[PDB]
Amino acid sequence: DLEATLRAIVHSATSLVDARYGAMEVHDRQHRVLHFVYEGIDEETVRRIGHLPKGLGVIGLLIEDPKPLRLDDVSAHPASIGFPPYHPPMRTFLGVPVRVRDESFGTLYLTDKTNGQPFSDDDEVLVQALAAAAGIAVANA
Amino acid sequence: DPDLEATLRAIVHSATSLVDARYGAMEVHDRQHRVLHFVYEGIDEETVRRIGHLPKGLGVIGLLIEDPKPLRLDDVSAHPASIGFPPYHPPMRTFLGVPVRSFGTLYLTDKTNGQPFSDDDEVLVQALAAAAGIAVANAR
Numbered sequence A: 001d002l003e004a005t006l007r008a009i010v011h012s013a014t015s016l017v018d019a020r021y022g023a024m025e026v027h028d029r030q031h032r033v034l035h036f037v038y039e040g041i042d043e044e045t046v047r048r049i050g051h052l053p054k055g056l057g058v059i060g061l062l063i064e065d066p067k068p069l070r071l072d073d074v075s076a077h078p079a080s081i082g083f084p085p086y087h088p089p090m091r092t093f094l095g096v097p098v099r100v101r102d103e104s105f106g107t108l109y110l111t112d113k114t115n116g117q118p119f120s121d122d123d124e125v126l127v128q129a130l131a132a133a134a135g136i137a138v139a140n141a
Numbered sequence B: 001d002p003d004l005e006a007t008l009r010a011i012v013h014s015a016t017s018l019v020d021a022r023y024g025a026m027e028v029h030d031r032q033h034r035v036l037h038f039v040y041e042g043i044d045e046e047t048v049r050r051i052g053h054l055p056k057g058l059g060v061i062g063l064l065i066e067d068p069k070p071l072r073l074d075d076v077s078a079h080p081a082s083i084g085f086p087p088y089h090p091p092m093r094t095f096l097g098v099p100v101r102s103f104g105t106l107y108l109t110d111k112t113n114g115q116p117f118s119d120d121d122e123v124l125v126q127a128l129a130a131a132a133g134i135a136v137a138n139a140r
């Protein structure tokens, strides 16, 4: 039920900022993954990847210190861990925390803006707003 | 609900800045149409004090509440449902309003280039309103 809500927010973000891929992870205070929702990857590829993210690399960075982050090439970030086998290669990156004041619960993130360009300042503002709505949904589950 | 309040203010702020509106507001109501939340941007405290009473959601805003559908207007005061601005309320012309869904209305006025709001503006603002709907629906 919560996941369907989170899935709508991802869908809205992905569509509005013209991203090829979008996802949201929600974690407990031990930073164990509770929910993982996404758009842009089909089921056969998901099976081939074979395991859910644990929130490492750049996502781990966002989980460690929740702050908006935009990168031209996520794989060049020093915190990058690299993609697992069969995971689509992704380059441009936009990530923002899913939170309320007292607490950060997760990360909403988008990759590979379909115009081949980096995500914009407006993209970031837009996704922060949708993330805030998601934060309310999570804090109230 | 501080958290909800903060989210609705961020959503109004994002809508207002993203479509370059001079003014932005959101009203939230129950099914009896009493005002639960009213959030706004672009008017200073001194002017708010002069206006005095909060909107009851009448005129064109009332229309959006009764029949929830996006509405873009070149001149809000020329709409036949228009009730007019109260004393000391800034006059406003161009208008973009969309239902928050329906729990309310997100609306913007006076795009700063003087032009009507665009199709893209409407799409952007309806998405933000949908987000506000989620925030409200998952409140308190």
Ligand code: HEM
Pocket: A021, A022, A023, A038, A039, A040, A041, A046, A049, A050, A051, A052, A053, A054, A055, A056, A057, A058, A059, A074, A075, A079, A080, A081, A082, A083, A084, A087, A090, A093, A109, A110, A111
């Ligand atoms: C569809 C939207 C998706 C996006 C935008 C996305 C994005 C990313 C990013 C940015 C990284 C970090 C790369 C780095 O730090 O070098 C990553 C890693 C990873 N991804 Fe995805 N991914 C998506 C889908 C998926 C899916 C569907 C799965 C599995 C079911 C998955 C599993 C993983 C795993 C296992 C890692 C390794 C790090 C970790 O375990 O957290 N991803 N992804």
Ligand code: HEM
Pocket: B023, B024, B025, B040, B041, B042, B043, B048, B051, B052, B053, B054, B055, B056, B057, B058, B059, B060, B061, B076, B077, B081, B082, B083, B084, B085, B086, B089, B092, B095, B107, B108, B109
């Ligand atoms: C800052 C963003 C604001 C916007 C975009 C906005 C927009 C509008 C518009 C377009 C109308 C005319 C409706 C019609 O003629 O049918 C209206 C009416 C009205 N406004 Fe505002 N307004 C804003 C702020 C405020 C504030 C701060 C107050 C009071 C403190 C206020 C109080 C009222 C009242 C009392 C009415 C008469 C109708 C009603 O009660 O709903 N407005 N508003």
